[model samples]
Target: SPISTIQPKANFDAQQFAGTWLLVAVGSAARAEATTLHVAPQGTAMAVSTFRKLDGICWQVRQLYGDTGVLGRFLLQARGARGAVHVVVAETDYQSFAVLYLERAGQLSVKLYARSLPVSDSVLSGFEQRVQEAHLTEDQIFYFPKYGFCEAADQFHVLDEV
Candidate 1:
């Protein structure tokens, strides 16, 4: 299904948006391999670290985001290939939880970010609701594993599949 166009938050703050985000659901056919993503500011750029575990081995991909002349959009060049990343703050309270939709190459990936783990049912319900509003099926929502198997930073590696 094609996702309906969504308006990005006019006052979106990239600095405030930097932090750890969990993958709550995905709207695309690609398997949800990413468990969490960490975004941190690097000078005038944004450094993103995506973490995932597959076949008992953990992987991490580091990408730098450059502004795309749009408020909530950035360009990511990974391994000589470029992709557009648009971030929509579907819902958030500036504290506690945030619902973000990451769209790229016609695929939308939903992320639910919280300051702490084990988010409340109320928050989950909000995420589910936004998923529907984004033209994504709530039935397709999937959860990641208990995040303890991630390898050490020195052991982390990136896969071509990511």
Candidate 2:
């Protein structure tokens, strides 16, 4: 089962995670490729917007839902240096988690992770290590952002109960 379906490592106020979080960092080596997934909330409904830069072009695809399973659609034919793949989120835990979702334009997605960005690289490194320990393919191109972050596709910069 997808880890998103699993509970957080501890109690979370989901509200805090609501906002335009930049892809300043990610656990997958694909970070150099695609790394941003935005969340937009409308009353009880919420949507995820994935943005990527291909050949100097920045584009976004959206997936709308109210649940944490985070299932959505690709707005375009997202083919990478490899091929099509299906992305999924797994090995999820409190404080840190991972995502394994669709990739290739029509193939299986790879796996990746993210954490609370602790005071040390150890936290991030630990997540990567765990993914590797699981023997899952990992894109370990991680970069701690010192500049920008991810923003929602629309005017909603934050997810509120509006």
Candidate 3:
């Protein structure tokens, strides 16, 4: 099937969107680990730093976000696989949380990112609401494992892959 595409909220600001984000919840079929993401503007693209834990090993992936000059639509190519990532819903503050929906081939995932771990109840609720607004069920969303300061930090230095 062709990948699906969606538009983000109107008047989205890419500048404010660049910053550190925590992966708190994932709405997909696979289980996930808590990870930290760093985003910054690099020329006409957005540089993203992401860390994830798998099989007791930590992995880091770096990717750049490109757009068709459209305010809310972005193209990301990682590990030689290209996909479309759209910011269907976004928070005005740009610091609290945002929902990014990505699609490739026949796979899709909705990611909920926050500014910190153990997101506040209100922030989680906002994320849930956005998921519901997208016609996605709450069951699709799964919270990631909680991490201790040293546990998460210890994995930060290891860049298994870029």
Candidate 4:
């Protein structure tokens, strides 16, 4: 009846999570080869920027995560996209890695992010555990490449708005 009763971090700190993060891997029910995310603290809300492969080319996608009045949850409304997505910080240590859980309707996806420095094996195992908890299997998880990341997407390659 639920995705393993996922819970948000008890005390999520937006200040500490504000910075550039590399998409190390993801446990999606589908996928992407590479992506880099830039998260900025914007008052009570957050501005999120993403760069990933789109039709073999790196493209940028921007998002404004409105504070949902919860400790570790945010509401996402992408440009031209219809429904809203609930984003939760399942877990994160700030300096090393972050695990994000996204949900919309019955759609679900989990993402793993890392700083430039390598994350501990325990973090990797934790990610896997969360994936399994979500009723996902090993084959559904995939890693991203260090290369082919686009931090900035120009006018022609970007999808952005408030």
**Whole-model Cα lDDT of every candidate shown, in order:** 0.64, 0.42, 0.64, 0.82
Candidate 4 at residue 119, lDDT?
Answer: 67
Worst 10 residues of 1 by lDDT: 147-156
Model 3 residue 44 lDDT score: 59
lDDT of 4: 0.82
Output the better candidate (3/4) by TM-score.
4
**Maximum-lDDT candidate:** 4
Order the candidate numbers by lDDT, best to worst. 4, 3, 1, 2
Clash pairs, candidate 1, are none
lDDT of 3 by residue, 35-100 (tens): 878788776567777877666666666666776476665676444454444333335468777777
Off by over 4 Å in 1: 1-4, 29-34, 77-85, 149-151, 155-162
Q: What is the overall TM-score of model 1 with all chains considered together? A: 0.72
Indicate the residue-level lDDT of 153 in model 3.
26
Model 2 lDDT per residue over 128-149, tens place: 5655653445555355443333
lDDT of 4 by residue, 1-162 (tens): 143367888888899999989888778785446788899999888999988876677788778999988878888865455676788887888998999988876678889999874768999899999898888899999877877666776789888757
lDDT of 2 at 138: 54
What lDDT score is found at residue 19 in candidate 4? 94
